[PDB]
Each structure stands twice: as structure tokens, then as C-alpha cells.
Specification:
Chains B, C: GO terms for molecular function: heme binding; iron ion binding; oxygen binding; oxygen carrier activity. Chains B, C: It comes from Homo sapiens (Human). The complex is a heterotetramer, with 2 copies of chain A (146 residues) and 2 copies of chain B (141 residues). Chain A has helices at 5-15, 20-34, 51-56, 58-74, 81-95, 101-118, 124-142. Chain A is mainly α. Chain A has one domain (1-146): Orthogonal Bundle (Globin-like), CATH 1.10.490. Chain A is globular and about 45 Å long. Chain A starts with a helix and ends with a helix. Chain B has helices at residues 4-17, 21-35, 53-71, 76-79, 81-91, 96-112, 119-137. Chain B is globular and about 40 Å long. Chain B is mostly helical. Classes of the chains: A mainly alpha (146), B mainly alpha (141). At the A-B interface, helix 2, helix 3, helix 6 and helix 7 of A face helix 2, helix 6 and helix 7 of B. The complex binds protoporphyrin IX containing FE (4 copies).
Chain lengths: 146, 141, 141, 146
């Protein structure tokens, strides 16, 4: 995770404007609609059969909010992603059995969600900073897998 | 495989793109170059500074080929045949790179089409770019 | 796409596999779980220790579906419809994992079938394993 | 490099028995036949129209030995691949323009070749240790790309 101060500033500056509740619901829901195989983990969530059933499902929204909340918290510790996510890593591996490739798909969907919300403000250099951040978060969430 | 709904979705989103295609082609490339630097190894002969003319020109060619695939959505392997031979026999771009460009095209359309880039459309556009990539890579070996 | 030479190459190597197919299947799974630990996430119900009967049994299954594919080589999509549905609507294994198993199957064949694992045959088997994979993931979305 | 002492010593002892000339020749050879698109960097080498031609091509054989020679040196710096391969990285990026993905491909071909040569001895644990080294080496080789 080699972020330059200029990259870290652009990342933190854009993040200040994000409504995480709403962005979290959109990202988790879009993941489930674009990459339907990821629904394997959420069969207790109910009807996930159509785009509207996914995007409007209150359990998908509640879970997205929680996912992005842990994510925002990681943005406050960009020099210690591994430590920050150590317990979540273990949980994802030993209890929930989630293949880490899932964290990379979610990162690329987040990037598109952010582009969708901010338009022009999501410049190629800004995107580049966020690509390194989502790669870093994904690797940290996978580091305790065994 | 593209479904009737996917096809309808891609035509709709691409039509809103219209005469901005070329410009979005270029922006997608600049995004790819900055976010995934390994992709520059394939354009050692281009100037890749912001606003480069070579990048603009190539953006247009990429977008025009995508416009061609949308117009021949039910016959893509044939409509893109020549492009597929080119990539397989001359360019020989490693296939992971197509995923990276496709991602940057999605980010570019999201950034410019806030009202049409719904979840259902994002899904269909993503499936379309994967199919185009598959065609272009089908003759590698 | 598999050429005639490829089919011939695949049929002959798998022919020498003969009755060890099951054992090789289990060995490949075992190499995969050790080399690529993320793959264990799809088998939490399995005892994954060395020599477990679930792995063995599963290795016979995998090996036998590949034998069926070799015999139905010109007709894969139909010979594998059922496994194709199984992986897309129930197991939902992420596509990247198929490359990890294929590589391990290749390492397994090379270690047991020296004389037969010539460069052209290695080439053929790798394209064959890729088509099977393509087939197993073609109905995901 | 996250290598165990029993992993490090499995790697080392197996290597002590490798004929680098042969293995290099075979790896680079097999790479060009199995993954034809890698031939883009070797137009000047000669005829590569057939596997027999590729495997027989002496420039290919010589280049293989040179590549595996460097890899062989790296195996004695397992605690510092990045620094050992730093200049090689720069040159592969800046002068040669080789997509780092090719490094992963050679790595996996290389592993199949070791199994082909060592049969029984190239056991699942020993392979797992070589996957780790081979990923490590590709990553070090990719590190200075910009
Ligand atoms: C950005 C990456 C992610 C972060 C930071 C994150 C964070 C979290 C957190 C904080 C929890 C709650 C832990 C608990 O209940 O004790 C959780 C639970 C969970 N996560 Fe992850 N998550 C991420 C990605 C994913 C993805 C990609 C998947 C699967 C596609 C996933 C699947 C799950 C599941 C199934 C649960 C338990 C759901 C339940 O309670 O029913 N997560 N995650
Ligand atoms: C959406 C997928 C892609 C499409 C539709 C596409 C299309 C095209 C087209 C139309 C050309 C023009 C060739 C001519 O003048 O006839 C071209 C050339 C080229 N493409 Fe692709 N391309 C795609 C992805 C890629 C990617 C992933 C790479 C590698 C990063 C790549 C590398 C190149 C290169 C190096 C050239 C030659 C440029 C030059 O020297 O003028 N393309 N492509
Ligand atoms: C060469 C590619 C593969 C082939 C030919 C193949 C074939 C099969 C077959 C025959 C079955 C048994 C279905 C039945 O019992 O009726 C199966 C099940 C299964 N496969 Fe796939 N498979 C492949 C790759 C994978 C991959 C890469 C994974 C994930 C890493 C995977 C995960 C599973 C799982 C978890 C089951 C169910 C296991 C159980 O509950 O017993 N397979 N596959
Ligand atoms: C295991 C990873 C690799 C290592 C350790 C390695 C190492 C080397 C070394 C030591 C040189 C000689 C540099 C010099 O003379 O200054 C070299 C040259 C070269 N390598 Fe790599 N290499 C690797 C993989 C690859 C791959 C996969 C490719 C492309 C398929 C490649 C392409 C080249 C090329 C094109 C040259 C220049 C050859 C010439 O003189 O015409 N390398 N490499």
C-alpha cells in the first residue's frame, strides 16, 4: 500500500462527502445484481430475484451500511490496514467462508458507485488513488486466510 | 450469453452516449493507464500525456469498434472478426488486460450517464464488455 | 477452440490415465488446497486432512466428469449441461478458482505421466481444461 | 517472503538437484508453445511456428538458461527478492516493455516442468512452497513498474 500524500489527500477529501449509509446499500446491492453468484452468501436475506428486489431489500441495505462502515474506518488507518482488519479477516475465513476474490469484486463495484455519484469530480487520478485503496483493503481482508 | 433485456439495455445506454463515444473511449484509456500502469507496456510508441492526440485518436477507434458491436449485437463474432485476428496474431495482448479496460469503460459511463446507469444497465453493460473481450481473445491459441 | 490435433492429444494422454483417474483427481484437489488455500472456502463441510475419504470421493467424481468430457469432446456444452447448471445456480464458485484446479490437474499429470507430457500435449491439455472451465461457468449470469 | 523454515529448506534442497541449463530451456520453451502470445517479445529469435521448432531453437534455449540463472540467484535472497530484482524490474518495464502477467505464466509453467522432471519427489507440500516462491518472484519483478 504505497499511497502518496497527494493520493491520500484526494482519497480523504472525497470520502468526506460520502453518505456511507446510502453508498453502502448501493454497492452491496449492485454486487449482487451484476455478479449473481455472490448471492450464495445471502440466502437468509429473502427475495433477491430481480434488480428491484435486491436494491430495495432492507436486509441488503442494513448489511451494506455495516460493510461500508468498517470500510470507512479503514480509511482512518491507511498505514495499518492489516492490523485494522485482522479480526474481520479471520471471521471471513473461519466462520463465514467467503472466497477473497469477493472483496476485489466489491472494490471495483464501489469504484463505479463512486463514479456514478460524483461524476466529473471522480477524475482519472482520483480513480487511480481509490483503486490502490480498494486493492489494499481487499488484501488486508485476505491476509489471515489459511 | 446476452438476454433480450441485456441487448435492449446496451442499445439504450449506447445511444445516449451518441457522439461522445470517441471522447469516452479516450477517457477510458487515460483512466486505464493511470490506474493500471502495467497496461502502458503495450503502447511504448504512444505519447501518453494528458490530452495526447494519439490517445484521442485511439480512443475513437476503440469506441467505433464498440459502436459496431452494438449495431451487430446478434452477430458479434462475425462483426469483430478482423479485430480478433489483429489482437491474436499481431498485438497479442494478454487477456487480463481486457478486464481492466472494460472496468475503465464502465467507470467512464457511470461518470457521464447518471440517469441511465442503473443497476440493471450496469449488469448488462458488464456482460456486453465481457462478451466483446471474449470474442477478441478467442483466437489466441 | 480445440483443433483436431488437440482432441487427439487429449484423448491419448487421458487414455494413459486409465484407472488412476480417481487417484489423480484426489491428488490435484490435494495440491490445490495446499497451494491455493482460498479454495478451501468452498469445502467447509469436508474433512480436508491428508487422505480424507471426502477428498478421495470427490476426486473420483471430478475425474469421471473429465473422462466424460474427453469422450464428448466435440460436444462439451451438452455433455456437461447438468454440471454447468450445478455450478451456476447452486455451488456458485467464483470463476478464478477454475484456473487454480486446472493448473493443479496439469501438475498432477506431468508428475505421473512423464513421457507423455510433451510440450504439444501440455499445450493441448491446458486448452482443454480451459474449455471445460468456460463451459462450467457459462450460465453464471 | 512468508516462507516457513521447512518450506525454505524444501525449496533449497530440491533446487540443489536442478540442471538449470535443461530446465531453463524447457520452461522458456514450453511457455512459447502453450501460451503463443508470449512470442511477441521474441520475433528475432527465429522460427517458432511449431513446438519442435521452438524447443529446438538455440536462442530460446540460451535465453531460458539466462532467465533461470537469475531466478536461481534470487533463491539465495529469499528474505529480499525486491532488492535483489529491483534493477531487473526496471529494465523489464522501461526497456523491454514486458507485461508482468507474463511472469506469472512462466512461474506456473516452471512448476509443471519441475513436476515433470522430479516425479514423486515434487510432492504437494513441495509444490505449495514453489508456488509461494514463484509468486514472490513475479511480484518482485513487477515492483518497479510505473
Ligand atoms: C469491503 C469488504 C468487506 C468488509 C469491510 C466487510 C465487513 C463486514 C462486517 C463488519 C461484518 C459483520 C461481522 C459480524 O457479524 O460479526 C460482515 C459480515 C458479513 N460479511 Fe463481510 N465485509 C466485506 C465484504 C464482504 C463481501 C464481498 C461478502 C460476500 C460477498 C461478505 C460477506 C459477509 C457475510 C455473509 C456476513 C455475515 C452476514 C450475516 O450476519 O448474516 N462481506 N462483513
Ligand atoms: C474493449 C476491448 C478492445 C477493443 C474493442 C479494441 C479495439 C482496437 C482497435 C479498433 C484497434 C485499431 C487497430 C487498427 O487501426 O485497425 C486496436 C489496436 C490496438 N489495441 Fe485493442 N482494443 C481493445 C482492448 C485492448 C487492450 C486491453 C489492449 C491492451 C492493453 C489493447 C491494445 C491495443 C494496441 C497496443 C493496439 C495498436 C495501437 C497502435 O499502435 O496504433 N487493446 N484495438
Ligand atoms: C475442472 C473443473 C471442475 C469439474 C469438472 C468439476 C466437477 C464436479 C463434479 C462432478 C461434482 C459432483 C457433482 C455431483 O455430486 O453430482 C462437483 C461438485 C462440486 N464442485 Fe465442481 N468441478 C470442477 C471445479 C470445481 C472448482 C474449481 C470448485 C471450487 C474450487 C468446485 C467446487 C465444487 C464443490 C464445492 C462441489 C460439491 C461438493 C460436495 O458437496 O460434495 N468444483 N464438481
Ligand atoms: C522468471 C522471471 C524472469 C526473469 C528472472 C528474467 C530474467 C531476465 C534476465 C536476467 C535477462 C537479461 C538482462 C540483460 O542482459 O541485461 C532477461 C532478458 C529478457 N527477458 Fe526476462 N526474465 C523473466 C521472465 C521473462 C518473461 C516471461 C519474458 C517475456 C515472455 C521476458 C522477456 C525478456 C526479454 C524480452 C529479454 C531481452 C532478451 C534479448 O536480449 O533479446 N522475461 N530476462
Amino acid at each position: 500500500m504505497h499511497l502518496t500524500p497527494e493520493e491520500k489527500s484526494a482519497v480523504t477529501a472525497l470520502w468526506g462527502k460520502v453518505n456511507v449509509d446510502e453508498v453502502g446499500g448501493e454497492a452491496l446491492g449492485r454486487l449482487l445484481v451484476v455478479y449473481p453468484h455472490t448471492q450464495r452468501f445471502f440466502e437468509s436475506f429473502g427475495d433477491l430475484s430481480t434488480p428491484d428486489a435486491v436494491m430495495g431489500n432492507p436486509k441488503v441495505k442494513a448489511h451494506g451500511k455495516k460493510v461500508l462502515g468498517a470500510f470507512s474506518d479503514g480509511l482512518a488507518h491507511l498505514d495499518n490496514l492489516k492490523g485494522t482488519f485482522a479480526t474481520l479477516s479471520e471471521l471471513h475465513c473461519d466462520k463465514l467462508h467467503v472466497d477473497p476474490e469477493n472483496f476485489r469484486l466489491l472494490g471495483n463495484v464501489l469504484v463505479c458507485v463512486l463514479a456514478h455519484h460524483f461524476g466529473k469530480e471522480f477524475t482519472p487520478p482520483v480513480q487511480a488513488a481509490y483503486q490502490k485503496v480498494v486493492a489494499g483493503v481487499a488484501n488486508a481482508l485476505a491476509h489471515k486466510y489459511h | 450469453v446476452l438476454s433480450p433485456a441485456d441487448k435492449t439495455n446496451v442499445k439504450a445506454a449506447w445511444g445516449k452516449v451518441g457522439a461522445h463515444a470517441g471522447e469516452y473511449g479516450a477517457e477510458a484509456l487515460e483512466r486505464m493507464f493511470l490506474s493500471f500502469p502495467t497496461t502502458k507496456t503495450y503502447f511504448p510508441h504512444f505519447d501518453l500525456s494528458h490530452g495526447s492526440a494519439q490517445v484521442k485518436g485511439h480512443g475513437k477507434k476503440v469506441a467505433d469498434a464498440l459502436t459496431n458491436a452494438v449495431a451487430h449485437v446478434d452477430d458479434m463474432p462475425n462483426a469483430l472478426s478482423a479485430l480478433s485476428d489483429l489482437h491474436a496474431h499481431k498485438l497479442r495482448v494478454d487477456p487480463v488486460n481486457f478486464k481492466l479496460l472494460s472496468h475503465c469503460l464502465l467507470v467512464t459511463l457511470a461518470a457521464h450517464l447518471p440517469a441511465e446507469f442503473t443497476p440493471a444497465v450496469h449488469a448488462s453493460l458488464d456482460k456486453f464488455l465481457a462478451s466483446v473481450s471474449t470474442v477478441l481473445t478467442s483466437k489466441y491459441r
